[PDB]
Enzyme design. Structure first.
Site, PDB file in Angstrom:
ATOM      1  N   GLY C   8      20.082  -7.971  25.327  1.00 23.68           N
ATOM      2  CA  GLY C   8      19.738  -8.162  26.728  1.00 23.68           C
ATOM      3  C   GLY C   8      19.085  -6.962  27.388  1.00 23.68           C
ATOM      4  N   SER C  10      16.009  -6.565  28.614  1.00 27.20           N
ATOM      5  CA  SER C  10      14.784  -6.798  29.377  1.00 27.20           C
ATOM      6  C   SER C  10      14.769  -6.020  30.696  1.00 27.20           C
ATOM      7  CB  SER C  10      14.597  -8.301  29.618  1.00 27.20           C
ATOM      8  OG  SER C  10      14.277  -8.955  28.393  1.00 27.20           O
ATOM      9  N   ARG C  11      15.878  -6.006  31.446  1.00 29.06           N
ATOM     10  CA  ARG C  11      15.981  -5.414  32.793  1.00 29.06           C
ATOM     11  C   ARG C  11      17.384  -4.920  33.097  1.00 29.06           C
ATOM     12  NH1 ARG C  11      13.864 -11.147  33.850  1.00 29.06           N
ATOM     13  NH2 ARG C  11      16.027 -11.590  34.566  1.00 29.06           N
ATOM     14  N   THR C  33      15.558 -12.915  25.756  1.00 30.00           N
ATOM     15  CA  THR C  33      15.855 -14.331  25.598  1.00 30.00           C
ATOM     16  C   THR C  33      14.658 -15.160  25.127  1.00 30.00           C
ATOM     17  OG1 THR C  33      15.430 -14.676  27.954  1.00 30.00           O
ATOM     18  CG2 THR C  33      17.710 -14.223  27.288  1.00 30.00           C
ATOM     19  N   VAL C  56      22.104 -15.076  21.978  1.00 31.44           N
ATOM     20  CA  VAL C  56      23.371 -14.574  21.442  1.00 31.44           C
ATOM     21  C   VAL C  56      24.425 -15.661  21.267  1.00 31.44           C
ATOM     22  CG1 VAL C  56      23.043 -12.223  22.303  1.00 31.44           C
ATOM     23  CG2 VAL C  56      24.171 -13.942  23.762  1.00 31.44           C
ATOM     24  N   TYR C 147      34.698 -15.393  33.377  1.00 35.95           N
ATOM     25  CA  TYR C 147      34.098 -14.080  33.149  1.00 35.95           C
ATOM     26  C   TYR C 147      35.172 -13.016  32.924  1.00 35.95           C
ATOM     27  CZ  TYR C 147      30.568 -10.371  34.051  1.00 35.95           C
ATOM     28  OH  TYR C 147      29.699  -9.300  33.967  1.00 35.95           O
ATOM     29  N   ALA C 149      38.316 -13.476  31.900  1.00 41.74           N
ATOM     30  CA  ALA C 149      38.994 -13.674  30.617  1.00 41.74           C
ATOM     31  C   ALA C 149      38.123 -13.186  29.461  1.00 41.74           C
ATOM     32  CB  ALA C 149      39.367 -15.147  30.418  1.00 41.74           C
ATOM     33  N   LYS C 151      35.739 -10.807  29.519  1.00 44.57           N
ATOM     34  CA  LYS C 151      35.626  -9.349  29.491  1.00 44.57           C
ATOM     35  C   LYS C 151      36.937  -8.701  29.046  1.00 44.57           C
ATOM     36  CE  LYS C 151      31.300  -8.736  30.946  1.00 44.57           C
ATOM     37  NZ  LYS C 151      30.223  -8.526  29.945  1.00 44.57           N
TER      38      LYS C 151
END
Lengths: 240, 242, 240, 240
Positions: C8, C10-11, C33, C56, C147, C149, C151
């Site tokens: 990831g 790109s930015r 992506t 991914v 999110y 859970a 992380k």
């Protein structure tokens, strides 16, 4: 009846703890800051406890009080270290006294009283040391560096002592209250108190009985495999 | 029928059985689940008047929905939910297959998401609720070969914190109980020596018992714990201290 | 020149990480992506990296991408798992797909990519796995159960893998950003963004470079005795 | 140059920190327990630092030392509180003096020195307070109740102060070393030291430079969005 010692039992959390441990079947010695305070505890407890005056900043008084309990009632087998005094200030208004007094009342007292009851618990191969900490040891606020450092020190102290005493089945734990309603939060404004409960997931201040319930659990045979932990009772104010 | 209903998954033996029996003693009507119909019948026989047994594969959303609907139709809303799973598929990462990963995450963490979601309505309507998730010391005390179990249990604890924030205003509490080394039929089968190396890591110098976990769940499910939410209650004898 | 893989890239945080690791001396493969996204990465990195397209969620693509890197550039010796996609919802409204997709993109991807790079790190007697977690794994708020859970699962995964790989000197750590300014927070209102920075002790949103600095530190020989930890970069939004 | 104050800089972790901050571009004042110790620091630092004698138990000396730095070199903009003295004992054998001295050297010193440098950091709109804690504040062992309580108190103190100073961009953090090789551990037996490294995931004792690297990171512009945290440098001995 096994003897429990609850410091600062006159009101609020300490009073609720002392009354609950009496209901649980302990003989409760509660301490107050003055003789008249101690007599009021004696009156309240009757047959099932006693009141004693104790300045927890004083090693000589700590020793005299525990010796008195040992001579008259039995070994201290449940010790609840309960202090709530604050001396808040942003750091460059926080004096040497403000620092020293809070560390002495909260953390040094836990060291001194825990040390003094170890013999009787060791001999009984039973013991509960339950320290009243605070959400503030984990949830940082400005102006509380002394209180926060003292409560975090208590929790770390408890872990090291739990390791030392574990083989003799003595447990050492902390209970960390959040925002609990007291005579002085009653005195606050309506608005300030709302600003407190809006941070709590359960959307309300707790009650002294909530802390007494947690202490009662840890002091019982329902918590015999729990040691070296912090039991958070804060309504979701702080989650870990 | 008129008692509050508690749902305890995996109640056949060990920690789940002790939890179910304790909640019955506490006054709940307990629905316990087993992995098979014969297992469920044995729960029904054991609980009598004060509970019921149902078969449930917690990997199955359709069965989760059918079981909770059945409880709602026959007994009442689920007001205490105990998510209890203990299956492991340990392996060093280089030997941990896609299935070993997926199955453990589904049985432990996805099941907590699905069952918690499904009981929210009845708890919200009752403005009372207890969701109590069985986590593990392993979510905090790392050891090799358990990456899937550890990730699932830590995910459960974080899930519980999020949901505790969501449901707190309606007085529903969401907590986890994290057992340490608890004696089971399976630790009974281990060697004497392996089991000693376990207890030598415990400050209390012994394995725990299923009743120790049941005691902690019973406390959290009671009116003695109404101001406790979003926490982990560690019951590990000092194996891990936080 | 050692190869780093940054997913990831790109930015935002991923781009800053990739550029910083290039400055540090790594050859950086960044993923996007889409093919056009990957070509933009290739253009940006020049001589010192390459761009590849990677979903991914796809085990076959994960394997094809790492195999391609091994065949053309060298073993992946620094792996940065970076994902930020959210599918927030109160539990009531959080669908099976909202749950599954977030767990797959964040946590399953960390499992799959970490597993796939272990061989080359083991053979090299050197490795850095650095997982982008979040303050949200520790600081609960409603609507983020999936999110949070994922992380927290990443952080626990990292501890287990750190124990497995430690003897071979491979470190496995997480970096947990707080509120970091992005194209997306630029789009928020002025008021909502203030409501974010007022929770931060440093009283401002962070920048992608702050996260890149922390990743760069962990990927370097200055962090060779740090493993199994979470490095919090949140300006005091959450303190532990 | 900006001035950094490193207490206890004679050897081990303190010496490595002081030398690293010199390499980073700070003018380093290091303190020693005696005048001859301070002269050795002066000799070692040359043009890029100075040595001063300081008993950190002494408020008057703390004030005299910081005033001397302000008068001769500039405001203290990086403060590294570094103490390692221990007075271990099981609680029954832990005297009042063993308790008081450890709490004073470790925790009270952090309170006093942090308070004393706040003005200059506030005026500069820049500051780094970096406290050397320990794995022991989190990983309990018997016989260390005083050291553990002091280090945990330091970490909680740091969180409160981080909240207080955050708006002025001053960061307050702790570094928590694990088992670090010292002159002291060199003297231990081969077997005792193996007992130590077998608890470490990386299977070795750390080095003072590992701690200096972490302090250098936090003191730099690469860590400007990190405050109120504990940076664990213990090789996986303790993972959080």
């Amino acid at each position: 009846r096994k003897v429990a010692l609850v410091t600062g039992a006159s009101r609020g959390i300490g009073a609720a703890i002392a009354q609950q441990l009496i209901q649980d079947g302990y003989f409760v010695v509660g301490t107050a800051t003055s003789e008249s305070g101690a007599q009021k505890l004696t009156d309240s407890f009757g047959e099932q406890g006693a009141g004693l005056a104790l300045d927890v900043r004083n090693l000589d008084e700590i020793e005299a009080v525990v010796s008195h309990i040992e001579q008259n009632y039995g070994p201290v087998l449940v010790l609840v270290n309960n202090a709530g005094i604050t001396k808040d200030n942003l750091l460059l208004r926080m004096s040497e006294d403000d620092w020293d007094d809070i560390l002495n009342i909260h953390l040094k007292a836990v060291y001194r009283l825990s040390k003094r009851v170890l013999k009787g618990m060791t001999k009984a191969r039973f013991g509960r040391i339950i320290n009243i900490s605070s959400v503030v040891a984990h949830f940082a606020n400005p102006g509380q560096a002394n209180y926060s450092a003292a409560k975090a020190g208590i929790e770390a102290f408890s872990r090291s002592l739990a390791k030392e005493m574990g083989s003799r089945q003595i447990t050492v734990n902390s209970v960390a209250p959040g925002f609990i309603a007291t005579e002085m939060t009653d005195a606050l404004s309506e608005d300030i108190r709302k600003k407190m409960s809006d941070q709590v997931a359960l959307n309300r201040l707790g009650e002294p009985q909530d802390i007494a319930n947690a202490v009662s659990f840890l002091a019982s045979d329902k918590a015999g495999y729990i040691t070296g932990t912090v039991l958070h009772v804060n309504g979701g104010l702080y989650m870990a």
